[PDB]
Amino acid sequence: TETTSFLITKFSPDQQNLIFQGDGYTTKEKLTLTKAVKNTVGRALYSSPIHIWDRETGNVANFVTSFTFVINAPNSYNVADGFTFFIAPVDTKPQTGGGYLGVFNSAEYDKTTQTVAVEFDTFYNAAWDPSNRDRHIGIDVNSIKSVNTKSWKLQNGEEANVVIAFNAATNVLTVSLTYPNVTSYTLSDVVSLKDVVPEWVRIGFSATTGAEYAAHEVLSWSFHSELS
Amino acid sequence: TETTSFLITKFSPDQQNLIFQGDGYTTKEKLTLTKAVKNTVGRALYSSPIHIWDRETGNVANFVTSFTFVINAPNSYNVADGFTFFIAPVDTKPQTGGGYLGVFNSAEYDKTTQTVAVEFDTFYNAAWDPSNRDRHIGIDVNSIKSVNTKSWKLQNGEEANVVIAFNAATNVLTVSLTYPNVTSYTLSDVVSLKDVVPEWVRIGFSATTGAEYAAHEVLSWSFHSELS
Numbered sequence: 383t384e385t386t387s388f389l390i391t392k393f394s395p396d397q398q399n400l401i402f403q404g405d406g407y408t409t410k411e412k413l414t415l416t417k418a419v420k421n422t423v424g425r426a427l428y429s430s431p432i433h434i435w436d437r438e439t440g441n442v443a444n445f446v447t448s449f450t451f452v453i454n455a456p457n458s459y460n461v462a463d464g465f466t467f468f469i470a471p472v473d474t475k476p477q478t479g480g481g482y483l484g485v486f487n488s489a490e491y492d493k494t495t496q497t498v499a500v501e502f503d504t505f506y507n508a509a510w511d512p513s514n515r516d517r518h519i520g521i522d523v524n525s526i527k528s529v530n531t532k533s534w535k536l537q538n539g540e541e542a543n544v545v546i547a548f549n550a551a552t553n554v555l556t557v558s559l560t561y562p563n564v565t566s567y568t569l570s571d572v573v574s575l576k577d578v579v580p581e582w583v584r585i586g587f588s589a590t591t592g593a594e595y596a597a598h599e600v601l602s603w604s605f606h607s608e609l610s
Numbered sequence: 611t612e613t614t615s616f617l618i619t620k621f622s623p624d625q626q627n628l629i630f631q632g633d634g635y636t637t638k639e640k641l642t643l644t645k646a647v648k649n650t651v652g653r654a655l656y657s658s659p660i661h662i663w664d665r666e667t668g669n670v671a672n673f674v675t676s677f678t679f680v681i682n683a684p685n686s687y688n689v690a691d692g693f694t695f696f697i698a699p700v701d702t703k704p705q706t707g708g709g710y711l712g713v714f715n716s717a718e719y720d721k722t723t724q725t726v727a728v729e730f731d732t733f734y735n736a737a738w739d740p741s742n743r744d745r746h747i748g749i750d751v752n753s754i755k756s757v758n759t760k761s762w763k764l765q766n767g768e769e770a771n772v773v774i775a776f777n778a779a780t781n782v783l784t785v786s787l788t789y790p791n792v793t794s795y796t797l798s799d800v801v802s803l804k805d806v807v808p809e810w811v812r813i814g815f816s817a818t819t820g821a822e823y824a825a826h827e828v829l830s831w832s833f834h835s836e837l838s
């Protein structure tokens with residue numbers, strides 16, 4: 383048995399258990415991924431690698447993470463590009479920015495990326511996003527074109543509580559986003575972790591801007607995993 | 611609030627959430643610090659830095675750690691040097707070996723060392739060890755000359771269960787050691803953690819051999835800290 387857990391309900395300016403990439407940094411008790419500026423990327427990784435699956439027994443870890451995040455766009459009508467929670471190899475670095483959200487590089491399935499991300503996409507990219515042009519929650523597996531998505535109305539400036547759980551027995555990854563004014567969205571899909579990501583991974587957040595922009599922030603974060 | 615927990619009941623050939631130094635490695639499901647050879651040092655740290663106290667609030671964290679260890683001396687009469695569980699600055703590296711247990715450099719107090727350790731000393735070093743020449747458990751603070759100690763009879767090759775707990779309210783550090791055949795030892799003292807170590811630290815194990823030697827292995831390890 384191997385387990386990993388942490389809880390940070392307030393971020394300090396010298397948060398040494400996180401690995402920052404791009405414009406990502408801590409300030410005023412909040413983790414800032416990107417400011418409201420064009421063409422940036424911000425990423426934050428928890429320092430310790432997680433044992434997501436066991437090569438020897440073939441076991442896969444059960445896990446759940448919770449975080450509260452806020453998106454502040456100066457113009458409630460022009461918002462881009464989004465925020466994501468992602469599971470990737472330990473040595474992971476920012477990928478394509480803008481619509482790619484700093485985690486992927488193509489709309490085509492690329493097994494070499496070995497990355498699963500749960501996106502909060504705020505800008506319609508015609509080449510791969512849902513035709514309805516709605517902002518949405520989506521589950522990505524080695525591609526920026528989600529395997530499943532769910533419309534979501536962004537409440538500019540409001541904090542959203544997100545819970546992402548993965549059940550090892552069913553291979554179901556569930557996502558839930560709740561706003562206080564009480565509006566909730568849920569989305570599920572079967573992800574076969576053991577065949578997408580390496581057995582040791584790093585988890586983090588990622589947010590990007592492009593021609594359109596907004597400030598992406600995390601105010602608290604917990605994670606708990608258990609590999610038997 | 612900031613909490614960090616982890617539990618490993620079986621070590622893997624590639625235990626990526628641990629940082630090894632000296633001859634420390636994992637094999638046969640155990641963490642091996644030193645083999646039964648002369649003059650070696652082996653350390654293992656948890657990859658993620660821990661927030662042990664906070665300057666702006668003045669708050670210090672409560673923590674507990676449980677581990678099982680084994681010392682195998684080829685000859686129960688000639689055994690050295692010892693094993694330690696320690697808290698030190700994030701960038702910590704192996705220090706002087708032999709009777710300095712890979713954690714300190716002298717028997718004189720040295721503030722820049724910023725290291726608190728709990729030793730399981732199996733060799734009598736005339737210049738600083740307790741005059742009775744007894745194997746002992748000690749609480750070291752910025753010096754290899756323990757602040758407090760307690761005689762301990764080594765049970766060669768046997769599994770020892772240890773619990774080291776720090777109570778932030780009273781600043782009391784307590785250590786307990788138990789052998790199957792049920793022999794127990796306990797020691798405690800008040801350590802002002804906030805005055806000795808930095809805000810962020812890394813925790814781990816250390817073991818060393820010198821002219822006299824023995825194998826030091828850890829069989830399981832859990833840790834939990836909570837800073838309000």
Ligand SMILES: OC[C@H]1O[C@@H](O)[C@H](O)[C@@H](O)[C@@H]1O
Pocket residue numbers: 462463479480481482505507591592593594595
């Ligand atoms: O910011 C909105 C959009 O800006 C464009 O300039 C980027 O090429 C595109 O990837 C992004 O989605």
Ligand SMILES: OC[C@H]1O[C@@H](O)[C@H](O)[C@@H](O)[C@@H]1O
Pocket residue numbers: 690691707708709710733735819820821822823
């Ligand atoms: O191994 C037992 C002893 O061996 C000596 O050679 C080392 O100098 C000393 O530090 C150590 O305590």
Ligand SMILES: [Ca+2]
Pocket residue numbers: 463481503504505506507511
């Ligand atoms: Ca998009």
Ligand SMILES: [Ca+2]
Pocket residue numbers: 691692709731732733734735739
């Ligand atoms: Ca000694």
Ligand SMILES: [Mn+2]
Pocket residue numbers: 501503510511512520526528
């Ligand atoms: Mn999308």
Ligand SMILES: [Mn+2]
Pocket residue numbers: 729731739740746748754756
């Ligand atoms: Mn001693």
